[PDB]
Amino acid sequence: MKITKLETVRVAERTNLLWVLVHTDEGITGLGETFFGAETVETYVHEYIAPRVIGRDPLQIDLLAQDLVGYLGFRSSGAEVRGNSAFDIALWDIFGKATNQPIAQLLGGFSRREIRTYNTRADELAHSLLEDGITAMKIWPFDAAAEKTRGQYISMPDLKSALEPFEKIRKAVGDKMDIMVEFHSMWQLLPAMQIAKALTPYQTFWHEDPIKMDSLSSLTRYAAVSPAPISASETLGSRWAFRDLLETGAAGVVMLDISWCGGLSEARKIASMAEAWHLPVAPHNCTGPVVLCASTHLSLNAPNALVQESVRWYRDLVTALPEVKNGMITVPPGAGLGMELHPDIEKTFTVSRRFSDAASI
Amino acid sequence: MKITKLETVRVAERTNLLWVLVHTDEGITGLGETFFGAETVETYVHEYIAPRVIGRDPLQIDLLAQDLVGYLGFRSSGAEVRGNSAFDIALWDIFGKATNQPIAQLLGGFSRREIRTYNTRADELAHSLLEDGITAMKIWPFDAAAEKTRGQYISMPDLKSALEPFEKIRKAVGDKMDIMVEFHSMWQLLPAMQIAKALTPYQTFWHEDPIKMDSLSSLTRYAAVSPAPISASETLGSRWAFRDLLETGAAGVVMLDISWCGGLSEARKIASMAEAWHLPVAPHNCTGPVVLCASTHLSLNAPNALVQESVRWYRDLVTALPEVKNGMITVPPGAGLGMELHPDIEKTFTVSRRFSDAASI
Amino acid sequence: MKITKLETVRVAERTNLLWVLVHTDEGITGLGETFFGAETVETYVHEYIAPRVIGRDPLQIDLLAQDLVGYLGFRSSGAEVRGNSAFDIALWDIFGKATNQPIAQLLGGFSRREIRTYNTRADELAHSLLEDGITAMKIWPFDAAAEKTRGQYISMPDLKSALEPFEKIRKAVGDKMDIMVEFHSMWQLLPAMQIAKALTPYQTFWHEDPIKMDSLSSLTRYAAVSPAPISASETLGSRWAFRDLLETGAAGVVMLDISWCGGLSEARKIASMAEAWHLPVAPHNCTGPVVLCASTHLSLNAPNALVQESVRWYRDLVTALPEVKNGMITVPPGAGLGMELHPDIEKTFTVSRRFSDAASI
Amino acid sequence: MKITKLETVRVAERTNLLWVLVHTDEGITGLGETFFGAETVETYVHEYIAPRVIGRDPLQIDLLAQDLVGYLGFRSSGAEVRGNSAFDIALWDIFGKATNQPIAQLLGGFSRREIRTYNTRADELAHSLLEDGITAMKIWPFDAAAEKTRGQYISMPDLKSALEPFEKIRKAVGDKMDIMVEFHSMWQLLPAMQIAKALTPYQTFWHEDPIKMDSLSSLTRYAAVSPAPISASETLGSRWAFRDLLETGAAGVVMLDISWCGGLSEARKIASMAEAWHLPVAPHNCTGPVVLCASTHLSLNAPNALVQESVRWYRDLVTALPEVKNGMITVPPGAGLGMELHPDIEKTFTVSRRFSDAASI
Ligand SMILES: [Cl-]
Ligand SMILES: [Cl-]
Ligand SMILES: [Cl-]
Ligand SMILES: [Cl-]
């Protein structure tokens, strides 16, 4: 079969989301998705990807991934890579539909049928999560302090204030809840280290993106004082960035976002490499439903998948969703992703579509 | 003063080029430029930069550079960074116009009034260049071989064929010409090393982008066998990527493209850092006239600028150009860049413009 | 324009201070300043700088900095460098006056309009500072013990005595005050490490110059045990010394004194390099008013400036001073520094001046 | 005994030279010397050293060396260190006179009674030197090329021209002459490496100061390609700079100048440390007669002294000189240096003297 058209879809009600639909001459359409800079990525999909992939065999997934790597903008989570990643997800959806297999199977099998999930007044939230069988939560109480000083400094009183949610959670539920801390790369090295040390009494599970992930050797300074492993990083793209992270000797939980890192194609390889370092992987969500679903496929396959993040309107965008039951998530049934865009989407949302085909490229 | 409008300009006759014009409430308009993915970068300029910079003081150059660094797509030469870089160049143009000073002065002074240039049948070309006082030339005779095997392999007969231009140049002009070799990041490590060793007899000046610049630690393997210093890399963005390059201990000639690396703002800092390593800088051109001009300003200021690359239609795009005389290049006279878009541009070219202002963001 | 005369000024009432005035043929006079060895630096200014700079264009700042680097005495804070640094500050003052711009603007813009300051019975002092909105203080209670043994040893009773001010401050104001510790490079490695460990309970903010900064690799031993980041070092000169510091992997807060390190020219480059390491800069004062002012310009520009040290007679030396309001400091208004030597100086002080011109060199 | 007066002496006919005379209450006067910035160092001697040493016991040599180390300007060859070094040489002269022993004896004995020397149309010079029994010569034919480009670049034709003296020397005398190459720290890293490789055919003995000695880790890059050991460096001061050099793993011949590095006191310790690395020392001269003489004392004592550089008017400045016979140099006879300032100096030269005593400090 051959790719005939690239279709991009946006909704005015959710401006960060972009869907990429890959049509074929066999009537099999693949669905992909990415998040942030939707208009920019959309332009890229039609300007750059379309003339390179119209007429091509979509089953040559590894080759197509290689053919879209840019002279510029590689090893990053920039617009080009986000576009490439969304396209790659759609190719896996096509491959699944063509073989009548779930993506998890095509990755090498369901190593598990479901996986533990985590979600993002802290003590009441903690109680509520536990009762629903969820035993991990991620919070980011230092972001407000970071914005005040652009991450160069935190006063001890502001630090103490930001520790209060941890004390509240521990007072409420004790050791029953894993607490992950997200820093959103907002801090410079010294205050990051200061905050890390201060978190020691609270038995935190991981410290995610404690500094900007642009010179990874700096992470060794952080690992030397951090009471929790470094979680890094949804902001990194390609297996080459992850080689660099692993070679620091400071890597902990390996985080990636399949729509930001080069697709399921790069993600599956990053995961197998992380396993060689005896480290786990945790694919990023809380963006769109397709990324949640495709990430769940990866998490059911990868032997070193630790947890699959999930959201505590998705139902109006797509035909089916991953299901969460007693704190565990699994994929919707069926070939490929196990979902498509909802038929009623243009009546619930304000939809814009753009097409490329043989005539337009 | 305050930024009032962002204007982007493209020409159908040169699809890779994008101009960014920053208008102010004082009637001072700054001109910036970047290359590759013009439509994509244009979308980004209006989607991301405009709502962040309309109403802002353009003289806070370092702050504006900081404020545009993305959560994703940083430390790269991707679309976001290219947009940011073009914008940054325009800010320097404004700063120059507001102070009635050339950009080279605002960077810290004219450390030289002109700088040596280089240009990209090889023996006849060499003779011709020398007669015009140009004593360096850059060639890329291995690219065809790379495309054949996607850079995994080169046969000895193909290697021998690609060495012929070097033999021709040396036979014609002997030691009078520096020969730079560009590889365009097309090769994997092993054939790159094989080619490097084979170039030994030809006394090459630098070996530019011999492999992909995505895991820089691999450059140590190359430096161990290369008869010429590594030139790297116009494909790298931000001073953080250049910190990583310098820390390999394999850095040679530090190459950057001001419109791909974060602007004059990041470029000037990369250059001063390279000097701390006793290494030179060589700003990339042969793209558009504004990048050539702004690069020349940087090259006249930076004490460690080694050469300024130049082209052997520019005249119809802008009002003035850098001048080359006896193999040396200098800036056009005047404040800022010393150039603006040509008044007659819409009659020579097929021009498209897009605007953002307070009403549209 | 061209430099016509170099003028040096000293006052008998403040023997450590030296001013350098750079006169031009356009009547624009630049003011610079340095501290320590005033007579020696003055001799150097006339013996070495004058014959090299009379007749030169002062706007070629980077070039003039390069031209004054000595065959001997480089990469240091010695007399030659102090002279060069004072001269460099005067060049920036000229550049500002010629363009009608504050120095902070010429460095790349006001990234902030004001910056947090710190000042040097400890509990009462702490209370007083907080009420004036100052939330950081620097103390050096170990110096007396160091002098007793030339820094080779501290008895446990003497250590305990030197910890008392920290206990007093914490008892009085708790976590509301950052406490910086200065050691003035008075200690050898082992007692420095012993003292560092003993400071753990007091949550110190930084440990400044804990040992002599002459073999920087020794700092790794200190960083391995110190509960606070290393602050280093006002005693280091040139970006090359700071490259060496950064490459230890033990660098913390990057301290410099613009009049000891090579001027605003070297300082601005040291700051941008430190940012590549995700570290902050803190320019040294409590010397003379011109250094305080020029340092404040740097601190308003450098995105990674953390704090600007200040004094808790300046008013009789110069025409205007940086202003402190609610613990924040900013520059005086106007082009260049925004200050000149006070017209009434020869009536408040015992003034000595020396001149070099075309006739004397 | 106690120091009573410090006397400095300069001659208008040799502006780079400075003598320091240390008078005592026992009538024993010590003679020291340094080179470069004579007026500046003279000011320092009276401003800084005098008030610290008048009234002190000159025999406490190690203690006095320690007491003069500056808060600023240490680990350098700057004015303060040059002053300290000249003073230290005078202390050794006093110690010698007080004990009726040559300085070489006080250092630990005459390990040799004489040492090989070297001197600085090349082929005719080589012949002449050999006939006088001198079998090493140092040349610096690359300096003119360095000045042209401030050390950033050398054209192949200029490189070829600078190699001609080596070809001339080898054609004339073959392998009979060791050829040392001095670069005077004039080159950046890349051209330094290029020049080093090009010198391979000429069997050079050492490559001295191939780059600036300000970030010594860069020397590893040079050592990886140099066909001769690195000679470094007369520009470095204190044993701490030499620790840094040794720790690079690239050190070769250890060069120092006793009047630039901290005196015989630091020099003797640098030499013993270099021996621990199985490396030789070569004390710098061709400055003044006192430095030549004191260096020769060091060279006769230090078991790892390799050669003592010498000049091919000294006789009118001092009472006695080191003697060269058949390419070997030895000290003049007598206690201390074995020389004093010539009695007739004020009639051959234009002499200026300055004094400090108990009344003036
Ligand atoms: Cl590891
Ligand atoms: Cl290096
Ligand atoms: Cl570090
Ligand atoms: Cl060694």
From TrEMBL, chains A, B, C, D:
Keyword Lyase in record: yes
Organism superkingdom: Bacteria
Domain Mandelate racemase/muconate lactonizing enzyme C-terminal: 121-229
Transmembrane regions listed in the UniProt entry: none
Gene Ontology MF terms: lyase activity
Keyword Lyase: yes
Key words, A-Z: Lyase
InterPro entries referenced in this protein's UniProt entry, alphabetically: DgoD-like (IPR034593), Enolase-like_C_sf (IPR036849), Enolase-like_N (IPR029017), Enolase_C-like (IPR029065), Mandelate_racemase_C (IPR013342), Mandelate_racemase_N_dom (IPR013341)
Cross-referenced CDD domains: MR_like (cd03316)
Protein name, per record: Mandelate racemase / muconate lactonizing enzyme family protein
